[PDB]
Amino acid sequence: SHTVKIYDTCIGCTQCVRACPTDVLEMVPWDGCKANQIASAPRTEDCVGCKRCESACPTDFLSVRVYLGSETTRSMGLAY
Amino acid sequence: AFTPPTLQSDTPSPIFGGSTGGLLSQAQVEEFHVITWESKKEQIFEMPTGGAAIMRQGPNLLKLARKEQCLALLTQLRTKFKIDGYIYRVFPNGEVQYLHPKDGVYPEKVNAGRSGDNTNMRRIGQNKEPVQIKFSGKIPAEF
Amino acid sequence: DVAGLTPCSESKAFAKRKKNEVKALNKRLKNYEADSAPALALKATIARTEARFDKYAKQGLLCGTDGLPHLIADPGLALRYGHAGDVFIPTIGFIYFAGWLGYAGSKYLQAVAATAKPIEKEIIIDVPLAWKLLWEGFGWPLRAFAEYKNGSLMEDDAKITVSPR
Amino acid sequence: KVQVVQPVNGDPFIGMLETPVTSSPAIAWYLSNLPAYRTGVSPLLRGVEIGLAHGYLLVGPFIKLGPLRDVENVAEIVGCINGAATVLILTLCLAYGAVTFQGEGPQVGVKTLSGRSIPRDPLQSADGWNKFTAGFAVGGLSGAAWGYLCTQILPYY
Amino acid sequence: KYGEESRYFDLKDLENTVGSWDMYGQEDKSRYNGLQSEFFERAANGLSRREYILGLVAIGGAGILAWGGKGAADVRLPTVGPQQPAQVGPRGRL
Amino acid sequence: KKVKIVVDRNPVATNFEKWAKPGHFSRTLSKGPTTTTWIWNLHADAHDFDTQTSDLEEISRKVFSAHFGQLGIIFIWLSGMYFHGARFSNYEAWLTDPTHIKPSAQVVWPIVGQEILNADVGGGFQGLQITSGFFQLWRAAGITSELQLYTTAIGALVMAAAMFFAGWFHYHKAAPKLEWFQNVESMLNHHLGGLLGLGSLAWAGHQIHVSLPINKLLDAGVDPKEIPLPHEFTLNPELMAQLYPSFSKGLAPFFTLDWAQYSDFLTFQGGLNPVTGGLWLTDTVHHHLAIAVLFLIAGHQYRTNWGIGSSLKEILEAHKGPFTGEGHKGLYEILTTSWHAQLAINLALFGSLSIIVAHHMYAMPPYPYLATDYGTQLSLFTHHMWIGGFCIVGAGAHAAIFMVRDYDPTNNYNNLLDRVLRHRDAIISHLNWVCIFLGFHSFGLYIHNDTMSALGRPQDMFSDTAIQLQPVFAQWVQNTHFLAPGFTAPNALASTSPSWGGDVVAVGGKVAMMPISLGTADFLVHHIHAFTIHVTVLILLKGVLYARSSRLIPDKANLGFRFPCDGPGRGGTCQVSAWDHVFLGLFWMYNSISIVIFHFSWKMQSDVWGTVSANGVSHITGGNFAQSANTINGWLRDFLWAQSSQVIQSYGSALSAYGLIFLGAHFVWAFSLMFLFSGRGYWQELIESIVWAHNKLKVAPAIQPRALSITQGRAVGVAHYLLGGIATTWSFFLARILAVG
Ligand code: CLA
C-alpha cells in the first residue's frame, strides 16, 4: 500500500493514467488547468510502485508522486 | 446511468493447451481475477502467462492470478484487436467485485462524477518539513 | 646536501648502479657478432645509458642512500641550493601549458555558445576557429588576469542554477 | 495423434500440466499408496511408518562415512547419530506444527480429480500434526535401533 | 467448475475453479493391522502433547552434553586425548 | 519460385553527405546532442539495423555489406601477419633450428628504454616472442622462404580491397533483393559443397603437391634453402615420385578404382610424427580428401531449380510426435525471416566448435614442432576457449532478442517453441535444482578437503589416498580408445592421440605428448566445470524463456529487450530484462572459462609438459596437481602463488611488459567495480555540483553532461571486469610459460 499524490501542477495530459499497469489513477473534472481535468488515485491499494506514472509526467517538477510504504500481497506483485 | 455488469459463469474460455504459469495456491486462499471480453472472430492471442491461446467467436472468459495480468491482456486486446473487456476480482468465499471500467468509462477519459481522491492543492516543495511532523506515523505528503 | 642527501656525482651507489647496468648490457652483447643488428642495438643502448648517467651526475641532481636521484619540491630550498629545475620550473611550465589548453577550450566554448546551434559546433568542431583560439590561448595569463580584474571571468551566483537545498 | 500432455484435470489455466510422469497409472497408484496421502488413516500410524523408513535409511551414511568409520564401534556411534538426527527432525516437525496450525479459517473445500467432494486431510490440523509428530518419534527411533540390529544380524552384510 | 465444455469458471462451484484437488489423496481405513496399530498408538500415547514431545527432544540435548562429558572421551576423541611435546617458535619464544 | 539472381540497381548514392551528419541512421537521434547520452546512443545503435528500418530487405542488404567489410578487415589483419612474418621475424632462421630458436615476429623501436622488449629469441634476431603458432602453420604449409610470405601478404591486401569493393558494390550498385537472401536451400547447398567441400579438396591438393614433399625433406633433414621449390614438385611427377613412388602411375589408379596404390601418401596411421611431434601430413591429406567428398555429397540434398532434392520446410513439418503436438512447424518461417534466430543458432554452434577446436588441437598437435612449443599450445587453447565462451553468451543474447522482437504467437501455436514457453517454470526450476546440487557436490567437496587438511585429518579427505572418487567412466573410455587400433579400427596403426595411453612422444628432449591419467582431482575439476556450465546455461535460458513475460512483470515484452528495470515497486525489478540476464551470464561464463583454463594449465604443467633425461620425465611442476588440486588452498598456493613468480619478477627483462600488463589489468578489473556497485543518482548529483563549478566560470558545455545510463553503467562494468580478468590471466600465462617453457 503505497501513497500516491497528485499536485495542482498537473496539466491534465492523462499520460500517467495511460501508463499505470494496475489501473490506480483516473481523470476527474477540475478547473485549475487548461485541460479542465486533474489526476486522482482512488485505488492506491492496487498500486505496485513501478513509478511508471512518474516517468510519463511532463511537468517540472512531477505532478504525481509515489511514496513506497507498507508492502502487501498486491503491492509486491506476488502471484503465489 | 451505469451499473456494474454481473459476471456470467457460462462464458466459455479461450482454446488453450495448458501451461505451468497459470493459477497457483494463492487463488484458493486469497483471491484471483477474471477478464471477460467479446470477440468478433476466433483468433490467436498471446497470454500473459506464456504461450498462445485462441479466443473464440463471441464471449470469452479468462481467469488469472494478479490484476496486472488481466490489465496487460486487456491492453493487448485494445491495442491489437480493438476489443473492450471487463475485469472482476473473485474471492474464495464466492464474492465478485467489478474492477477496471469502474464507471463504464475508461480512466484516461474524464467522466465528471468520480472521486478526486489523493489530490493535494499545493506544490511538491510546499509540503511540511520532516522535522515539523516528527514522532508521527505520517510522511510529509499526507498533510 | 639538503635533507641528508649526497650529490649523485660523489655517490658511490650511483656509480655502482651505472656500472652494473652497463655490465648487464655488455653481458647480453657478448652473445652476438661485432657488426650485426642486435650488436649495434645493444651498443646504442649502452651509449644511451652512459650518457643518461653522466647527464644526471653533471646536472647536479641529489642521490639518496639507494643511489637514485631525488627531487626537491620546495621554493627557496630549491632556489638557494640550485634545484629550481626539479619541481619549480616544471610547475611553471605545466601551469602555463595547462592554462593555455584550458583557456583555448573556454574561449571556443564561449564563442560557439552564441551560435544558433551550439551543440553541433561541439560535436563538429570549427577547425579555423579552433586554430585561431588555440593560437590566442598562448597569451592566456594576461587575458585571464585582465578578465578577472574586469569581472567578466565570473558568473553571478544569482544567475547560476542551484538545488532546492 | 495421441497427446500424452494435457492440462491438469482438463483445466488449462492452472499452473500445472498432466504428463506421463505425474498422471501415469502406476506412478499415481504408488504415489497415492504412500502414508502421506492417506486421508482416512490415522496420522499417528502414518507417522510411525514414515519415521521407521527414514530412521532406517539414515544410519548407513554415518556408518560408512562417519569420522569413526574405520573403527569396530562405528555401528553403535552411528546408531546414536541417527537417533540424534531423528530427534532434531522431530523438533523440526513440532515447530512446523506449532507455527502452521495455530488458527482456524473457513478454507475452501477439497475435491478429487473426478469432482467428488472429500474432507481435508486430518493431518493438516493442530491435533493431526501432533499425533503424526509423535508417531514419527517412535518410528524414527525404532528405525535407527533396527538399523543397528541389522548390522549385527544379516549373514551377508 | 462445470467443465462440461470450455467453461472453467463457476461461481456456484468456485471450489473446482481454483484447482483445489487432492490429486493423490485417497481415504481408506482398511490397511494397518489392528494388533500392530494398537501397539504403536499405545507406545505413543501421551507423547502427542507439545510439552511432552519437546521433552523427548530435551533428552537429545542431554545426550549432547553427555557426549562431551563422557561420550567424547569414550570414543577417544583427539581433543579429549593427550598431547605430545611442543615447539619453540620463530625466535627465542615459547 | 525458381531460385535466381534478383538484384536492384543503384539503390544508395555514394557521397559523404551522411558522413557529416552523425546519427542519420536513427530517427530518435535527430534532435541533436542535447545531452551527452546522445553520444553513447549513437554508438549503441549503429549496428542495430532492426531499429533503423522496418524493411527486412534493407536489413539483409546492410548485413551482407557488413559481412563484406568484416571480411576485408580480417584480410587486412592476415596481410599484416604475413608481412610481419616476412620482414620482422626469424622464420628463416627458425626453420633451421625449430627446437631451440623461439619464434618472434615483432620488433619494437627504441624510444623510452622499451628496446628491452626485444628478447634474444635466437638466430641473430631480437624481437618479441610470439605465441600465435604462425611459424608452425607456415612450416606445415611449406613456406620455407620469406618471399612467399611477402607474396601472401600482398595477395591478402588485394583480397581485402576486393572484399571492401564487394561490400560497396552490393550496397550502392547491385543490392540483392529479399527473395535472394531467403534461398536457404541454395545457400546450404553452396556452403556445404561449394564452400566447405571445395575448400577441403583444394587444401588437400595443395598438401599433396606442396606440403608433403617439402615437409618430408625437412623431416628427413635437408637445408630449407636446398629443398626444391613448390612448383618443382607440383609440376614434376618424377621428383615427387622419387619422394612418393605411387606417383609414377599418375592418375590411372584413381580412375580405375584402385585407390590402394595411393596408400603411400594417403595413409591412416595415427598418433604423431616422432620427428616433428605433430600429426602425419599424409593422414591430414587423407582426412581432408574424405571430408571433402562427404561435404560435396552433402551439398546435394536440398531442392533448388530442379525436382530432385529435399525441402527444409517439408522435413521440418514432418517431424512431430505425441509429446510435441504440432512439432517443428513454423521453424522454417522463423529461420527464413529473422536474422537474430539464425545469429543465435550460428553463434552457439560456432562457439561450441571453437571449444572443440581447442580440445582437439592440444590433444592432437596438427602442426610440426607445435606440441613442444608450450607457450603456443597454452595460448591457442586459452584463446579458443575464450572465443567459444563469448560466442555462446552472444548466442543466448540473440535468442532473447529474437524472442522479444521477432516472436509472433499467431505463427507459433502448439509447436516446439510454444510448448517450451508453456512450461518454462518446470525447466527453470529443475535447472536451478541441478545447479544447486552440482554446486554443493562439487565445491563442498573442496571445502570439506580444506577443512580436513586444516584440522589435521588427511585420511578423511576426498583424495586418491583417502576416500577415492575415481572417474571410472572417463578411464574406461580412455582405455577403449587406447585399445582401438587393431581391434575396433583394424586399419589404424596407432591411436588418435597419445593421451589415451601408450608410450611418451618427445621431440628435442621435451615431451610433446604423453598419456594423461585421470584421478580424484580430475573428477572434482570436471564436476566443477559441469556446475559452472550449468549455471551459465541457467542464466541464459532463464533470460530467453522469460524475456517476453513473467509472473512479476506480465508485459515485459512491451518494455523491450534492453531496459534497466520497471521501478522499485513489487519489491524491486532491477535487472529483469533479457539484456541483464546476458550481463550476468557474461560473468558466469568468465568464471567457467577461467576455471577451465586454470585446470588445463596446471594439468599440462604437472602431468604432460616436461623434459626426458633417459631416466624418466621431469615435469615443469613435478606432478603436484595429483596431490594438491583437491583443495582450494592447493590451487591458491601451488598454482596461483607458485606460478606467479615468473610474472612478478619480469621487471628488467624482456618479459617486463607481461609484468606491466599484469598490474594494469588488475587495475581495470578493480575499476569495473566502481561501475558495478554504484548507481546513476549519485553520479548525476556529483555531476550537478561539477556543472555548477563550470557555470561559475562560464565554461559549461551546451551538450549537458549526464551520467551513464543504468544499462550503460552495467555494460561498462562488465566490459571492464572481463577485460581486466582476461588480461590478468593472459599476462600471467604468457610470462609463466615463456619463462619456464
Ligand atoms: C568511399 C566509399 C563509400 C562512401 C562514400 C559511402 C557512403 C555512405 N554509405 Mg557506405 N559502404 C562502403 C563505402 C562507402 N560508403 C563500403 C566499402 C561498404 C562495405 C563495408 C559500405 C557499406 C554500407 C552499408 C551497409 C551502409 C552504408 C551506408 C552509407 C551512407 C551513410 C552511412 C555512412 O557513410 O556513415 C559513415 C560511416 C563511416 C564514417 C565509417 C564507418 C565505420 C567503419 C566502417 C569502421 C571500420 C572499422 C575500423 C577498422 C575500426 C575498428 C577498430 C578500431 C576500434 C581500431 C553513405 C552515403 C548506410 C546507409 O545507406 O544509410 C542508410 C548503410 O547502411 N555503406
Ligand code: CLA
Ligand atoms: C560455391 C558458392 C559460394 C561460396 C564459395 C560462398 C562463400 C561465402 N559466402 Mg555465400 N552464397 C552463395 C554461394 C557461395 N558462397 C549463394 C548461392 C548464396 C545465395 C543463396 C549465398 C549467400 C551468402 C550470404 C547472405 C552470405 C554469404 C557469405 C559467404 C562467406 C562466408 C564467410 C566464411 O566464413 O567463409 C570464408 C571466407 C573466405 C573463404 C574468403 C574468401 C572469399 C572467396 C573470394 C570466395 C568467394 C566466393 C564467391 C561466391 C565467388 C563468386 C563471386 C563473383 C561474382 C566475384 C563465404 C566466403 C556471408 C558473408 O560473409 O558475406 C560475404 C553472408 O553473409 N553467402
Ligand code: CLA
Ligand atoms: C557475429 C557476432 C555478433 C553480431 C553480428 C552481433 C550483432 C548485434 N548485437 Mg551482439 N553479441 C555478440 C555477438 C554479435 N552481436 C556476443 C558474442 C555477445 C556476448 C558478449 C553479444 C551480446 C550483445 C548484447 C548484450 C547486445 C548485443 C546487441 C547487438 C545488436 C546491436 C549491436 C550494436 O550496434 O551495439 C554497439 C557496438 C559497440 C558499442 C561496439 C563496442 C565494442 C565493445 C564494447 C568494446 C570491447 C573492447 C574490445 C574487445 C577491444 C578492447 C581494447 C580497448 C582497450 C580499446 C547487433 C545487431 C545489442 C542489441 O540491442 O541487440 C539488438 C545488445 O544490447 N549483442
Ligand SMILES: CCCCCCCCCCCCCCCC(=O)OC[C@H](COP(=O)(O)OC[C@@H](O)CO)OC(=O)CCCCCCCCCCCCCCC
Ligand atoms: C549424461 C547425458 C547428457 C545429457 C543430459 C541429460 C539430462 C537432461 C534431462 C532433461 C530431460 C527433459 C525431458 C524432456 C521431455 C521431452 O522432451 O519430451 C519427450 C520427447 C518428445 O519426442 P516426440 O515423440 O515429440 O518426438 C517428435 C520430435 O520430432 C519433436 O520434438 O521425446 C523424448 O523422450 C526426448 C528424450 C528426452 C530424454 C533425453 C535423455 C537421452 C539419453 C541420453 C543418454 C546419454 C548417455 C548414455 C548413452 C549410452
Ligand code: SF4
Ligand atoms: S507507481 Fe505504477 S501502479 Fe502505482 S500509480 Fe504509478 S504507474 Fe500506477
Ligand code: SF4
Ligand atoms: S502525467 Fe502528470 S500532468 Fe499528466 S495527468 Fe498525470 S499528473 Fe497530470
